[PDB]
């Protein structure tokens, strides 16, 4: 069946898409993050530099709004928005909903990430134990209200700015991917962590927990894992900074193997790896930083949602992998 | 139809494998309908350039008839040395009996040919075009009740490491989408056609515009073009022909093509190619100076990319479509 | 008069210099930083990945230490190194002098920063109020047992790559710049902050306090106040990191303006750009970073001490200013 | 002695002013010990490359001889259309009557001229590379008691600001150090001299190499030099003669250049130029394939920028020292 916002990419390196707020439908661009657990968009309220070049909910001229007012920061590790909750009507894709977001009134803990960013607002697409002020996730609000068939969602992501990326909720669409699926139940209902002894060529780290974020540009790994890693393989570690560079061919580049009960999972580095430069020789920027978190854990984001199709199933506790289709 | 796939190479080149021989020796073909012969390193090719080549031993095929004549291909790129042969040619899987060019002095084309990963070229020209007056291959093809028709199609892949595609005998569906006007050549020699050469300001009206797939690049008559960037941000890297521009550049235009019957139009994300992308991200320009006749345009590679193109020796036509983007 | 430790220069980015530490004579590389105020080295005794290509001394073979051993964290914005503090004879230049300093024993906190360096420790070069342990200065405790004419020291950092930089202590020498001293009251002898009314092209910042910092690589500034400086004038920020590319003759890039009471102090661009690309059109890379630090706090580093020769001067409490010879 | 103030564009080519006429007209000029002949856009040069050029209007100049006969330049890399005629020429502080080319049609030599930013050349060759045996300016001042020595020195900066000199009459101190090796031309022709040619393994003994400022570069026979970057590091970028390496390479060897008295050597330091240079560092390099006579070789300005150049008529001879680094 399926319904879906579609994606645009800005240099591969975050996604957005338009979702409505109120009953007078006013637009919104988003990042839906299945890293993170609330909604929010800039309010009509906030007067720091960051919300001046941006989208502004007026929950005055929404005839459905109702007031909470509870104030709240939310501090992601890229920084920290502040508002209060508000109560309205949200539409995501054409589906309509009521919903508790945040009216973000001061973000200049997350700017220049926001000043320059072309995106009003976040929408979180985790579980419910990853939200502040314990909110349902919305593909779960949206099935408790006969929305929809499942209270699933997908990810396609594409490979750049006029090619479209499309998040669908409550169906699985052939469209999008070939083979068939593979599943992994989750770790804990969190994040969209699963479970996995990973294999990046020379190192493996037994059963590991694997976030899979549409919201990161990028591969992560713990740091020591890291270091232990690069090694050895002319990768150049540009100083102070978590960017690391490398000749694109630099043929001792291994394939990364995530491997499971069921299934195995790879990655090409023709998919962790940026063009910088192509001129003959031809440089790039290796897409794996360093980022320590509670078990051994990683972040798949981008690069692997890149080439793998994703089904994420509130249902069953679920995410299912198959090749994205090229076209 | 039937097509040889077409390989990619830095976008600046494509090449197709062909077989020549009763003994069916394999080779790497540029498809050039800017030329109207077919050539090959014979085995006595002596030139060093001709070392890692794919040769055609005149022994091995039961089919070589022998000819002899002595010839010269002074292609602007350069020129080769050989004499005439003939044999068993094949296109995909199309074998008929061909004239042809073996390659026996290779030393006044190289550098570009000892780089090139490709063996010979193939005219996709015009009979008159030709040296040694031999019959374009698919005017062959067809006066041998081979094919359907003295037509061909150019699809040429936008992007690096995938497909492209000479088709013969008929158009193909998948290929293109929505329509496909067609123009009608101005001599029966290049594919040239007769243009309404919109670009920015500057026309050029009833300019001679050549298709051609051997060109990897665009050209303008050098002072039309000199004229033309001149105010928009495109600096030019000294004694190469060789233009560097940001891909954003909003001063670039799109260009224009129209006819009695249609328009064509070429959008700066057709006629740049990417070199740098961190932060601001920089592309080189393919649209290069090259003067010759009237107002003469090479349409190459850039052009081909986006309009599919279908190459008609019956209808005296050429004939373009939106390339299927995938 | 002035002695000098000749100072290595790595990509215009860090620079550094030998010195001495024990009775033997046990050579390592340091920064020298003015911008903090303790000496440490790696300990015989460290254990941790970023020591294990370091020069690590033993207090052991050196006839002179005496012990200490009450541990230290050591809280850079780079990082933390950790250890004990030991007591034994250093020599800079070649002027000897007690010292209490830093044995490091554990690193793990401030590589790949240390991982990635060619240098084994730090000199701190600030003043008595920015050390952990209220340790007085080097340089005055040089003049404090009769080592040196007076209590003052010099940067001079070269122009490109090659070509050296030198430290010189208690003596100013003309070798190293052209016209004369314009000097400048700190206004806390905690770094080497002075007090500037600053000027960039378009928005100015009454009296800020500027802290110069031979330890730092770049311009740093307050993230509003950089924000608001780019806009306009065609610099991309390349999307999560701090970094600024630009086209080197961008002829919208200001003139940096610093003013005060006597003086005026200016940096042209070309001064705080470094190239990338130079294939006709020409990339640059914009050496300025948003920086939060307490009052409207600019750190003039590496870019600025390149145009500006400079005197730290204890006895006085003043930085002094002079254009560097070219040559 | 008396020296031209060149200056530096991209390290591809150097300029300097010198006057023609009694009204003094300036002009910006290439200096070029690669061809003999002295010319300007005439103010008749019709052509549109003419248009941001200085022109010489044979009005403005009292000693403006007539002469009239029509004449061809034909640069390998372009030529040139006018009429000769007669003035008198000023360089640096030196004046003195020559004939030279009015130049009237540059079309054939084009991109390369409207872009650049000069407007005539200077030969620095000899009378008998001379179109129309023009005694070259040296030995005409020389024979007009005017300087010592029919001699010149190319000393050559490195970086874009820094500036070059041609200095006339005499060698001087402050452009070198230490000693100065002479070797012999093979003809009096171009500066060519005769060099046992190392680099690498491959040597090609006794092999002619030329002098010669005008060119930006280092070239080489094109069948030698292809083998020679086989298996280094340095890629070559499609069809245009351009070669990237990253610039620690270590593959890279320096260059031999023995004779009879003395060896001269080209570290790969003086024949790269960086492109990209940002964790990884990629550096282009100024040797290109281009083929000759003899293995004629053909030192440029990378060669130029390490080593002073003495240009000696009278004894017949070419010198070098190390450019005094700064
Ligand atoms: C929900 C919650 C509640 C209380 C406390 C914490 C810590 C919580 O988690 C939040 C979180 O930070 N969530 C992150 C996930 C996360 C958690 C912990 C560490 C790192 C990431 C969220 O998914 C996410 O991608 N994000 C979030 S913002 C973003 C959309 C820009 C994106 C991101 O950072 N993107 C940037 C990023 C992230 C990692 C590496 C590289 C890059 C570059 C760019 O891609
Ligand atoms: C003139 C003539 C008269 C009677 C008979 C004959 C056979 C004649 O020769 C026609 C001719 O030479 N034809 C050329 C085409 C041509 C026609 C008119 C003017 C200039 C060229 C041949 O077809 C062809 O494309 N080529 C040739 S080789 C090639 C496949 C590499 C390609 C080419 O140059 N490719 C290169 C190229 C060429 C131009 C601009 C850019 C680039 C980049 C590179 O990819
Ligand atoms: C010692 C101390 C005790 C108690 C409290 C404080 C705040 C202390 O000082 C902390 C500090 O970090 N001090 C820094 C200075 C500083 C002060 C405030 C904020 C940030 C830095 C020390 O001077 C220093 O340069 N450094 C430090 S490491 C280094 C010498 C390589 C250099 C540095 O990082 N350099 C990196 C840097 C720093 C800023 C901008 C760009 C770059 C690139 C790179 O060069
Ligand atoms: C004068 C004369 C009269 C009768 C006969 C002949 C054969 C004559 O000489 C021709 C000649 O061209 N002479 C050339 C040298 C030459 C000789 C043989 C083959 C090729 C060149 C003259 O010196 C010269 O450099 N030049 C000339 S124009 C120039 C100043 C741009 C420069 C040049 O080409 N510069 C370009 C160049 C040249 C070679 C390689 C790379 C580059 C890049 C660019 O910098």
Not at 167 to 177: A, K, M, N, S, V
Not at 201 to 226: H, Q, R, W, Y
Not at 296 to 317: A, C, E
Request: proline content about 4%; overall charge negative.
């Amino acid at each position: 069946a399926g319904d879906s916002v579609t994606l645009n990419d800005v240099a591969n390196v975050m996604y957005y898409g338009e979702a409505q707020i109120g009953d007078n439908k006013q637009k919104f661009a988003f990042i839906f993050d299945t890293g993170s657990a609330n909604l929010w968009v800039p309010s009509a309220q906030c007067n720091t530099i960051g919300c001046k070049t941006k989208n502004l909910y007026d929950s005055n001229k929404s005839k459905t709004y109702e007031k909470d007012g509870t104030k709240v920061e939310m501090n992601y590790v890229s920084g920290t928005v502040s508002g209060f909750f508000s109560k309205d009507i949200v539409t995501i894709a054409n589906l309509s909903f009521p919903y508790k977001f945040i009216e973000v009134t001061d973000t200049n803990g997350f700017e220049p990430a926001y000043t320059l960013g072309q995106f009003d607002g976040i929408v979180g697409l985790g579980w419910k134990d990853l939200s502040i002020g314990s909110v349902d996730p919305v593909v779960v609000e949206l099935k408790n209200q006969n929305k929809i068939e499942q209270a699933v969602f997908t990810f396609y992501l594409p490979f750049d700015d006029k090619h479209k990326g499309y998040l669908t909720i409550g169906g699985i669409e052939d469209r999008f991917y070939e083979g068939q699926l593979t599943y992994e139940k989750l770790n804990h209902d969190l994040y969209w962590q699963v479970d996995l002894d990973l294999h990046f060529g020379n190192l493996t780290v037994e059963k590991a927990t694997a976030i899979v974020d549409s919201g990161t540009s990028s591969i992560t790994a713990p740091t020591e894992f890291l270091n232990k890693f690069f090694e050895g393989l002319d990768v150049v570690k540009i100083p102070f900074l978590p960017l690391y560079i490398t000749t694109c061919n630099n043929p001792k580049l291994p394939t990364l193997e995530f491997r499971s009960a069921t299934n195995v999972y790879t990655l090409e580095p023709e998919y962790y790896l940026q063009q910088i430069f192509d001129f003959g020789i031809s440089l790039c920027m290796v897409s794996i930083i360093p980022v320590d978190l509670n078990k051994n854990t990683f972040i798949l984001g981008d690069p692997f949602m890149r080439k793998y199709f994703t089904v994420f199933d509130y249902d069953n506790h679920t995410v299912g992998f198959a090749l994205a289709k090229k076209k």
